[PDB]
Enzyme design. Sequence first.
Site, PDB file in Angstrom:
ATOM      1  CE1 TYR A  76      -6.756 -23.033  18.222  1.00 51.62           C
ATOM      2  CE2 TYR A  76      -4.425 -22.839  17.590  1.00 51.62           C
ATOM      3  CZ  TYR A  76      -5.415 -23.348  18.422  1.00 51.62           C
ATOM      4  OH  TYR A  76      -5.083 -24.178  19.456  1.00 51.62           O
ATOM      5  CE1 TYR A 119      -1.596 -29.332  13.605  1.00 49.77           C
ATOM      6  CE2 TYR A 119       0.361 -27.951  13.309  1.00 49.77           C
ATOM      7  CZ  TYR A 119      -0.846 -28.445  12.844  1.00 49.77           C
ATOM      8  OH  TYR A 119      -1.292 -28.066  11.604  1.00 49.77           O
ATOM      9  CD  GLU A 142     -10.231 -43.571   7.051  1.00 51.76           C
ATOM     10  OE1 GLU A 142      -9.220 -43.353   7.759  1.00 51.76           O
ATOM     11  OE2 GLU A 142     -10.198 -44.291   6.030  1.00 51.76           O
ATOM     12  CD  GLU A 173      -0.378 -25.690   9.540  1.00 53.68           C
ATOM     13  OE1 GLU A 173       0.041 -24.673   8.941  1.00 53.68           O
ATOM     14  OE2 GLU A 173      -0.166 -25.875  10.758  1.00 53.68           O
ATOM     15  NE  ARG A 176      -2.319 -21.249   9.839  1.00 50.61           N
ATOM     16  CZ  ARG A 176      -2.627 -22.124  10.791  1.00 50.61           C
ATOM     17  NH1 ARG A 176      -2.113 -23.353  10.769  1.00 50.61           N
ATOM     18  NH2 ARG A 176      -3.461 -21.780  11.758  1.00 50.61           N
ATOM     19  CG  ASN A 191      -8.040 -42.431  -3.290  1.00 52.30           C
ATOM     20  OD1 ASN A 191      -8.205 -41.642  -2.353  1.00 52.30           O
ATOM     21  ND2 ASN A 191      -8.744 -43.551  -3.414  1.00 52.30           N
TER      22      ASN A 191
HETATM   23  N1  IEZ Z   1      -6.640 -26.072  16.555  1.00 55.03           N
HETATM   24  C1  IEZ Z   1      -5.601 -25.656  15.846  1.00 55.03           C
HETATM   25  N2  IEZ Z   1      -4.347 -25.891  16.275  1.00 55.03           N
HETATM   26  C2  IEZ Z   1      -3.269 -25.471  15.593  1.00 55.03           C
HETATM   27  N3  IEZ Z   1      -2.041 -25.722  16.084  1.00 55.03           N
HETATM   28  C3  IEZ Z   1      -0.918 -25.340  15.439  1.00 55.03           C
HETATM   29  C4  IEZ Z   1       0.322 -25.584  16.049  1.00 55.03           C
HETATM   30  O1  IEZ Z   1       0.377 -26.230  17.092  1.00 55.03           O
HETATM   31  N4  IEZ Z   1       1.386 -24.886  15.604  1.00 55.03           N
HETATM   32  C5  IEZ Z   1       2.695 -24.946  16.300  1.00 55.03           C
HETATM   33  C6  IEZ Z   1       3.837 -24.539  15.367  1.00 55.03           C
HETATM   34  C7  IEZ Z   1       5.206 -24.551  16.082  1.00 55.03           C
HETATM   35  C8  IEZ Z   1       5.834 -25.763  16.414  1.00 55.03           C
HETATM   36  C9  IEZ Z   1       7.080 -25.755  17.055  1.00 55.03           C
HETATM   37  C10 IEZ Z   1       7.695 -24.534  17.366  1.00 55.03           C
HETATM   38  F1  IEZ Z   1       8.940 -24.521  18.011  1.00 55.03           F
HETATM   39  C11 IEZ Z   1       7.071 -23.323  17.037  1.00 55.03           C
HETATM   40  C12 IEZ Z   1       5.826 -23.334  16.399  1.00 55.03           C
HETATM   41  C13 IEZ Z   1       2.666 -24.000  17.527  1.00 55.03           C
HETATM   42  O2  IEZ Z   1       2.083 -22.897  17.406  1.00 55.03           O
HETATM   43  O3  IEZ Z   1       3.252 -24.393  18.563  1.00 55.03           O
HETATM   44  C14 IEZ Z   1      -1.053 -24.649  14.225  1.00 55.03           C
HETATM   45  N5  IEZ Z   1      -2.332 -24.388  13.709  1.00 55.03           N
HETATM   46  C15 IEZ Z   1      -3.427 -24.789  14.380  1.00 55.03           C
HETATM   47  C16 IEZ Z   1      -4.723 -24.536  13.908  1.00 55.03           C
HETATM   48  O4  IEZ Z   1      -4.926 -23.952  12.848  1.00 55.03           O
HETATM   49  N6  IEZ Z   1      -5.821 -24.980  14.649  1.00 55.03           N
HETATM   50  N1  IEZ Z   2      -8.637 -18.163  18.359  1.00 55.98           N
HETATM   51  C1  IEZ Z   2      -7.604 -18.804  18.892  1.00 55.98           C
HETATM   52  N2  IEZ Z   2      -6.350 -18.552  18.462  1.00 55.98           N
HETATM   53  C2  IEZ Z   2      -5.279 -19.186  18.987  1.00 55.98           C
HETATM   54  N3  IEZ Z   2      -4.039 -18.906  18.528  1.00 55.98           N
HETATM   55  C3  IEZ Z   2      -2.934 -19.519  19.020  1.00 55.98           C
HETATM   56  C4  IEZ Z   2      -1.650 -19.192  18.554  1.00 55.98           C
HETATM   57  O1  IEZ Z   2      -0.702 -19.973  18.673  1.00 55.98           O
HETATM   58  N4  IEZ Z   2      -1.513 -17.922  18.118  1.00 55.98           N
HETATM   59  C5  IEZ Z   2      -0.225 -17.349  17.655  1.00 55.98           C
HETATM   60  C6  IEZ Z   2      -0.267 -17.101  16.132  1.00 55.98           C
HETATM   61  C7  IEZ Z   2      -0.108 -18.447  15.417  1.00 55.98           C
HETATM   62  C8  IEZ Z   2      -1.238 -19.197  15.048  1.00 55.98           C
HETATM   63  C9  IEZ Z   2      -1.069 -20.431  14.404  1.00 55.98           C
HETATM   64  C10 IEZ Z   2       0.227 -20.896  14.139  1.00 55.98           C
HETATM   65  F1  IEZ Z   2       0.408 -22.035  13.532  1.00 55.98           F
HETATM   66  C11 IEZ Z   2       1.347 -20.150  14.507  1.00 55.98           C
HETATM   67  C12 IEZ Z   2       1.181 -18.921  15.147  1.00 55.98           C
HETATM   68  C13 IEZ Z   2       0.119 -16.072  18.459  1.00 55.98           C
HETATM   69  O2  IEZ Z   2      -0.611 -15.799  19.440  1.00 55.98           O
HETATM   70  O3  IEZ Z   2       1.134 -15.426  18.118  1.00 55.98           O
HETATM   71  C14 IEZ Z   2      -3.084 -20.464  20.042  1.00 55.98           C
HETATM   72  N5  IEZ Z   2      -4.373 -20.764  20.521  1.00 55.98           N
HETATM   73  C15 IEZ Z   2      -5.449 -20.136  20.006  1.00 55.98           C
HETATM   74  C16 IEZ Z   2      -6.738 -20.413  20.476  1.00 55.98           C
HETATM   75  O4  IEZ Z   2      -6.943 -21.231  21.371  1.00 55.98           O
HETATM   76  N6  IEZ Z   2      -7.833 -19.742  19.911  1.00 55.98           N
END
Ligand code: IEZ
Ligand code: IEZ
Length: 263
Positions: A76, A119, A142, A173, A176, A191
């Site tokens: 993250y 997101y 950009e 991503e 991952r 490109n």
């Molecule tokens: N700053 C930051 N934000 C991120 N946000 C996401 C992200 O919003 N993932 C979504 C994936 C998701 C989307 C829809 C669902 F029904 C369930 C999961 C989420 O966790 O809700 C996933 N990865 C990141 C990340 O790596 N860095």
């Molecule tokens: N360090 C940090 N991690 C975070 N992790 C999440 C988050 O959605 N975590 C998930 C794991 C996850 C992380 C990224 C994804 F794309 C999907 C799932 C969880 O708690 O099960 C959400 N927000 C944060 C955040 O603000 N800071």
Amino acid sequence: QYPIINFTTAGATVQSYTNFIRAVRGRLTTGADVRHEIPVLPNRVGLPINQRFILVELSNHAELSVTLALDVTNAYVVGYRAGNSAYFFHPDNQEDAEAITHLFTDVQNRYTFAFGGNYDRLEQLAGNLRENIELGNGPLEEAISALYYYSTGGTQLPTLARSFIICIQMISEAARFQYIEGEMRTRIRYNRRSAPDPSVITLENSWGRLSTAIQESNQGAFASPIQLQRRNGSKFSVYDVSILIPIIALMVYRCAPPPSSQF
Ligand SMILES: Nc1nc2nc(C(=O)N[C@@H](Cc3ccc(F)cc3)C(=O)O)cnc2c(=O)[nH]1
Ligand SMILES: Nc1nc2nc(C(=O)N[C@@H](Cc3ccc(F)cc3)C(=O)O)cnc2c(=O)[nH]1
């Protein structure tokens, strides 16, 4: 203290991007946890703070640099540094709030955004969904400039949010998912910038669920199928870890691995 991986969009090639993503994965995973040939990220439980983050220093053709901070437990993007200022997303919990106090400690100006970094929140602020935000080397170039100029008022909030969305997909991503890395390699090779297709979007959305399904599987077999999408939007079902080995590069820790069955 925290490891730094460098990447530049300036003259980026398939090879330089591939080296970058490989290096990121190498700093994210320890090698301690590999299940059905798929590495698992460090468990947050009992993970020492000195091992919690990696730094991704992004440079561009415009001779600007920003440094993203990534949480090793989930890849993250928690925030970034540009020169004299650092910016962090609103932490999701108390542990993550404490953790970010260990980042960019010698920076003059520290800000925590009032918004979280998922997101959904970023798309709201950008005024565009991921499906309509172009990715590729040009967008990343950009995005680096946009993050750099935020503190001086040059970058509007929608542009900043869009720029985060670009960085997260092209770094986290891609780390991952080998599949998403491949999609970015293609954009770089020709490109050609383009928004992510449904196969990319549904993989991103399913990372947590796929991680859990694999880790909770019976010898690789899912109890419940997971629906993904093809490039054309058509649905296909995932029943087993086997099909995901070329697709997913790392998983978030979800449960302990079960003991092996012996005769
Ligand atoms: N700053 C930051 N934000 C991120 N946000 C996401 C992200 O919003 N993932 C979504 C994936 C998701 C989307 C829809 C669902 F029904 C369930 C999961 C989420 O966790 O809700 C996933 N990865 C990141 C990340 O790596 N860095
Ligand atoms: N360090 C940090 N991690 C975070 N992790 C999440 C988050 O959605 N975590 C998930 C794991 C996850 C992380 C990224 C994804 F794309 C999907 C799932 C969880 O708690 O099960 C959400 N927000 C944060 C955040 O603000 N800071």
